[PDB]
Design a binder for these strands. Sequence first.
RNA 1: AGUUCGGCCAUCCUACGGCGGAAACUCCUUAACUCGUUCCGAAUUAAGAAGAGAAGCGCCGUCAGGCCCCGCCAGUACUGCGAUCGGAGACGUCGUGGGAACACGGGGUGCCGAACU
RNA 2: CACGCGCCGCGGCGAGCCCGAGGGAGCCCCCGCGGCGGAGCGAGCGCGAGACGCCCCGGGCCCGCCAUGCCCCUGCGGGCG
RNA 3: CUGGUUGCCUCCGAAAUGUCUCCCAGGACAGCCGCCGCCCCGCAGUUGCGGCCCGUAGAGCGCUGGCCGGCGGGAGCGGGGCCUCGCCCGCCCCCCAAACUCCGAAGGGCCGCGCCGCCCCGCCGCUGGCCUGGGCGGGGCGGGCGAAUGCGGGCGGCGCGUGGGCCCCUCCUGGUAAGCAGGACGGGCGAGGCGGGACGAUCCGGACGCCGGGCCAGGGUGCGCCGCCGGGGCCC
RNA 4: AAACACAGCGUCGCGAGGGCCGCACCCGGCGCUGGCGCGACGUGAUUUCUGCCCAGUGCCACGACCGUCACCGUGAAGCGAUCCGCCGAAGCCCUGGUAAACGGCGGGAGUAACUAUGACUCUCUUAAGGUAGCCAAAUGCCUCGUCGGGCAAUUUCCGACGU
RNA 5: CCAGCGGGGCAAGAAGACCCUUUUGAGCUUGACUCCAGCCCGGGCCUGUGGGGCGGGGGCCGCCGCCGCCCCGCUCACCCGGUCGCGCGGGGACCCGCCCGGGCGGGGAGUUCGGCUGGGGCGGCGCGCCUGCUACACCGGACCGCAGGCGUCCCACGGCGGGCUCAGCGAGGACGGAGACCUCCCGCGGAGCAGAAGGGCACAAGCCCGCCCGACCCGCGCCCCCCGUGCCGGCGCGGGCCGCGAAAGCGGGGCCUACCGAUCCUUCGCCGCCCCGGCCGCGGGCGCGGAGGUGGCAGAAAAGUUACCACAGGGAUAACUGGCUUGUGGCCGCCGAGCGCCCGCAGCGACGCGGCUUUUUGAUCCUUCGAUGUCGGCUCUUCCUACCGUCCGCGCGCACCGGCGCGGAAGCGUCGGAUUGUUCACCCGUUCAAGGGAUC
Lengths: 57, 30, 93
Amino acid sequence: AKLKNHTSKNQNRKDHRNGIKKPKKSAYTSHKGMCPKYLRNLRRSRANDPRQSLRPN
Amino acid sequence: GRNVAFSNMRRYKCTNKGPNLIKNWFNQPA
Amino acid sequence: VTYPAERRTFCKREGKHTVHKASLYKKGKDSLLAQGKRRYDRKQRGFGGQTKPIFRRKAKTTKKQVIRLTCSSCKCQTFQVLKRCHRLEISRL
RNA sequence: AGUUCGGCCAUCCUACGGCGGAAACUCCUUAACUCGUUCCGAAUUAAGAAGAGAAGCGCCGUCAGGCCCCGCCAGUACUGCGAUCGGAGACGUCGUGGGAACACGGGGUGCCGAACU
RNA sequence: CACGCGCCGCGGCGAGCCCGAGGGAGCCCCCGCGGCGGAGCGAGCGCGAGACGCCCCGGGCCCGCCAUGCCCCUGCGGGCG
RNA sequence: CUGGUUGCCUCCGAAAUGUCUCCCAGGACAGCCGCCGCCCCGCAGUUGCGGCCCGUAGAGCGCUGGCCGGCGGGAGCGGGGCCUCGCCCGCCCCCCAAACUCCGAAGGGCCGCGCCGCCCCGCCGCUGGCCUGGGCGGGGCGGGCGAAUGCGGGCGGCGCGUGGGCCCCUCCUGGUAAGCAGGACGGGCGAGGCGGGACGAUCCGGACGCCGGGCCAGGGUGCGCCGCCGGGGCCC
RNA sequence: AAACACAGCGUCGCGAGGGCCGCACCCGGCGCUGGCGCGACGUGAUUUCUGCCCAGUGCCACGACCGUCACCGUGAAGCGAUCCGCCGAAGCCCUGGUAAACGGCGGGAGUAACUAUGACUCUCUUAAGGUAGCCAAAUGCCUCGUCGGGCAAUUUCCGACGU
RNA sequence: CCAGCGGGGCAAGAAGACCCUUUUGAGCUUGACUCCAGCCCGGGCCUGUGGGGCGGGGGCCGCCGCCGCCCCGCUCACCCGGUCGCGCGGGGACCCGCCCGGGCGGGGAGUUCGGCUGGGGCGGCGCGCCUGCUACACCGGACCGCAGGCGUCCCACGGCGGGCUCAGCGAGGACGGAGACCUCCCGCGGAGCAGAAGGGCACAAGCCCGCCCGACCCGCGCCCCCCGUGCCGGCGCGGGCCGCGAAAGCGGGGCCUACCGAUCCUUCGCCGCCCCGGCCGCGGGCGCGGAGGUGGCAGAAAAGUUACCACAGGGAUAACUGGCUUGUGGCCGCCGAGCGCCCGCAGCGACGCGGCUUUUUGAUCCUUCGAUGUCGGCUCUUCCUACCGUCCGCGCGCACCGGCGCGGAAGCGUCGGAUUGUUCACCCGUUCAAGGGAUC
Ligand SMILES: [K+]
Ligand SMILES: [K+]
Ligand SMILES: [K+]
Ligand SMILES: [K+]
Ligand SMILES: [K+]
Ligand SMILES: [K+]
Ligand SMILES: [K+]
Ligand SMILES: [K+]
Ligand SMILES: [K+]
Ligand SMILES: [K+]
Ligand SMILES: [K+]
Ligand SMILES: [Mg+2]
Ligand SMILES: [Mg+2]
Ligand SMILES: [Mg+2]
Ligand SMILES: [Mg+2]
Ligand SMILES: [Mg+2]
Ligand SMILES: [Mg+2]
Ligand SMILES: [Mg+2]
Ligand SMILES: [Mg+2]
Ligand SMILES: [Mg+2]
Ligand SMILES: [Mg+2]
Ligand SMILES: [Mg+2]
Ligand SMILES: [Mg+2]
Ligand SMILES: [Mg+2]
Ligand SMILES: [Mg+2]
Ligand SMILES: [Mg+2]
Ligand SMILES: [Mg+2]
Ligand SMILES: [Mg+2]
Ligand SMILES: [Mg+2]
Ligand SMILES: [Mg+2]
Ligand SMILES: [Mg+2]
Ligand SMILES: [Mg+2]
Ligand SMILES: [Mg+2]
Ligand SMILES: [Mg+2]
Ligand SMILES: [Mg+2]
Ligand SMILES: [Mg+2]
Ligand SMILES: [Mg+2]
Ligand SMILES: [Mg+2]
Ligand SMILES: [Mg+2]
Ligand SMILES: [Mg+2]
Ligand code: NA
Ligand code: NA
Ligand code: NA
Ligand code: NA
Ligand code: NA
Ligand code: NA
Ligand code: NA
Ligand code: NA
Ligand code: NA
Ligand code: NA
């Protein structure tokens, strides 16, 4: 008793049913895989800037 | 996808035969 | 495959490179007071026969050989894993 | 015009003839020193200045091979969409869009940039 | 239908909340502990949170676990990074 | 695993696929769908314009292989009678390839189509020979909404059914073939009433509340059976 | 029914403190028995016969204790739990016996005055290479084998033949 | 409406007994796997009272108290026999019993006996991975599709630096030849780079030489397959320590695409923590990382048989009718190399090409497993024509007789026997004896 092995017949219609979802607008600015030396320098420059430092007083 | 916490209740014992393991409280006022 | 008798390698205890001596690692003898052994011995008492599975469908014909390296200045032990091979010789200095 | 260092990597390559050097590059001369060749100062390393355009190099030529551009090949081959269009089929046709290749003919044959003479 | 688990809606109170068993001779009235919540992380000895914000997302800092540099009291202890 | 599972109306509405499974008449996770919401941040199964990618049809024999002959040169070698055909070198020529390609479409895929320009200032524990860079911010000046067409968008929670599919068009593979077996873009039946194709789940039209009137798609207009004539040609 | 039984034939075990069987225990049966007996198996009246193989598996040695193979016991070490040695019953291993135990029982070449065949030779090879007999049999695929008998005519039947 | 009849109602009678599946059974077997009675063997207790031998605590002598094994008495335990206990025996501290230990043990018990699959079985392994094609120019894409490969090999066949250029054509050197070795020339790779195939590579990724061990330690992220989970493999980084090189640089193995493995348990390694009334020493456990393996490769511990048999189901799936197909079987056209004394066609007709049929057998699996009674013969009816005799025409290599070919034509005829269940076949005979269909 053999049954079907494979079909992609209806798959493109199912994909378009609710549109093709775009990624989130925060995935474009993640620090997920950035060079660590660059990230460390960015942190220290912000903290020492009086106009953008969040340190209290 | 079902996401539940697993139950930790034991299966019942001696339901149709054996000692009576059910206690009712209909006699509380009396 | 042939392996050198001596190798200059990183030493964790002293934190630098030093000369090490090569040897072969073998499994030790089974103890009778390990917790798993105690549990197994307790479970096999009495009637009932065998209580745990016994493996019988071997497939591989080799093993992964392990070399033991002994630091010659501090007695720190290290291990290196070779790929699968059929016979291995350590050269003699 | 030359040399050093480069960019793009044949319109710059390959073969065969010819022209040229003041300066430059090159070929050239020597083996104490330095360094060197499975053996060899051939190569390479060091030290020179008697010779030379004979090569390399720059330029010219060839009904040259190659490489590059334009035409023709040809709206042909093939093809997207529509057709109760023809045909037993194999295949073809019409409408509406896109559109080659080989071959052949004509022409061409390095520029650009920074420093010195 | 009973018990257990997840999520949603509604009522009461709210850093709190709660007819437990039981006792007062009042099916419905009065009194009535745990518990859960309030602080986490760590195998464990244990150590232990403030810095920003209508809301949401994200950054930035802080606590625990792991690893390091400098200083010092009561010291394999404390502090700062 | 087989059989059965009891009132009405209204609003929405599938899947027969991917991975794992002592899995193949079953399940879990994902997809498709319903309900419940919450928030306020421009969207698109389309064309146009601009950048980049692919090696299929066709074409061809330069590469890797294969394959008919014709004619010339002979250093060397062989057959045969210093001669005469052969191997070799050159040109010409017939026919080829899912696992050949110097060339190469139609066709597809990805990205872009509003903020810009000038000046000055601050921080860095990164980077540079330096007064170099890069990154992140602040302050002033000028300018402005720069393809078409259509149209509001985004996110979360809980949960069901399904996981035997089949047919048409065009494109393929195995097989002598098959209403055979296995794949691909789009559509349909499943789960789509109505008219036509005499007759059919799928073909040609058209996708549905209950009615009156009008117009007419597809298909037809001797009689059964609603609806026809005129003109040109052929004719067992 | 061609199946079972059967008389006959053969093998095996046991001398009582034994053998075989029952049975939870206590106790039982054969047995009111004693080898001309009891129990366990195979073949199946008479006649005539019953070939070779102990490599395999099985069974048996009042054969042997070689190696291995328990608890117990005993020696050393240790704070003790423990650990390491020695000791070594049966069994297996070893050496033999046994087929009316289970069972098994070969290939290729050459060769005699026509041809044909092959008494004969060579060669590989086994634990042993199917003996006396019998046969297209209730057992032969090819096969409805070939020859003879019987029939007008026979895939049936009978007699022969046999790698 | 009646007497009859047996063509239909796939007539009735039964949740197919054949076949397949289900992580549904049972009977039986054994050299399946896990065991149990029973039996054999050893030690100890039951269990007294005496004697003796041996072996262990250069030569022994041992103390007579230490340790083992062994042997021989006695009777009082214990056991057996005879007797109406009328005028008596036999064994014996062994046996038996009980405890622990070893062996034998289908006599008995429980349980298992994979999957895919043009039905199942036999066979094979697209059951984990890799190259090219199938595949129709992004990506993806099936088959028991095509041609193949993997479960390894290497302390150098690895890292780095330097230097060099390979295969080969042509020409020359000669004991020397179709090839040894030497030299020059030109040489886009036609060589080599561990093993499949496809890519890549020239002052190199190839060959030779020098020095080395980055084939290291700590911690993160991404890509491929993909549910955007795991596993194998790869890549990009932050620190530590190193190798080579003048230096810039490069180096987490063999140029790239394959070469491998969870939980539980065991074993090993560094540094620490716990053993809960305390402290100390052994021992146990715990946090991190390797190794021991599951190839049916996301990973149960597993042999047969049923013709005595089942259970739940299945036309999701075989065996018999029917349907589509026509390779094979059967029938029929076209062509004309030749045969035929000569003479392609009176009669034949090679090499090739085009059709038809469903009276053979295959291929497939659409309908039917809560059943359509499965071969042949006997009996009886009807139908086809692709015509064997008889009818009517024509042709001949047709004198007559007898034959052969073609067209129309389905009315009648197509038989009796021996052997075989046979259809078929084969033989004897005769008025000389076609072929088929209708649920074969
Ligand atoms: K499945
Ligand atoms: K070619
Ligand atoms: K007998
Ligand atoms: K024997
Ligand atoms: K026989
Ligand atoms: K006869
Ligand atoms: K099938
Ligand atoms: K039988
Ligand atoms: K039938
Ligand atoms: K025909
Ligand atoms: K049936
Ligand atoms: Mg499926
Ligand atoms: Mg709707
Ligand atoms: Mg499994
Ligand atoms: Mg082509
Ligand atoms: Mg299903
Ligand atoms: Mg079909
Ligand atoms: Mg349905
Ligand atoms: Mg529809
Ligand atoms: Mg009318
Ligand atoms: Mg004989
Ligand atoms: Mg015979
Ligand atoms: Mg006979
Ligand atoms: Mg007979
Ligand atoms: Mg007869
Ligand atoms: Mg009747
Ligand atoms: Mg009837
Ligand atoms: Mg049934
Ligand atoms: Mg039944
Ligand atoms: Mg199953
Ligand atoms: Mg069973
Ligand atoms: Mg059994
Ligand atoms: Mg199966
Ligand atoms: Mg898989
Ligand atoms: Mg180099
Ligand atoms: Mg580093
Ligand atoms: Mg698996
Ligand atoms: Mg019937
Ligand atoms: Mg019936
Ligand atoms: Mg006719
Ligand atoms: Na137990
Ligand atoms: Na926040
Ligand atoms: Na209709
Ligand atoms: Na007798
Ligand atoms: Na036998
Ligand atoms: Na039974
Ligand atoms: Na891999
Ligand atoms: Na079917
Ligand atoms: Na038929
Ligand atoms: Na029939």
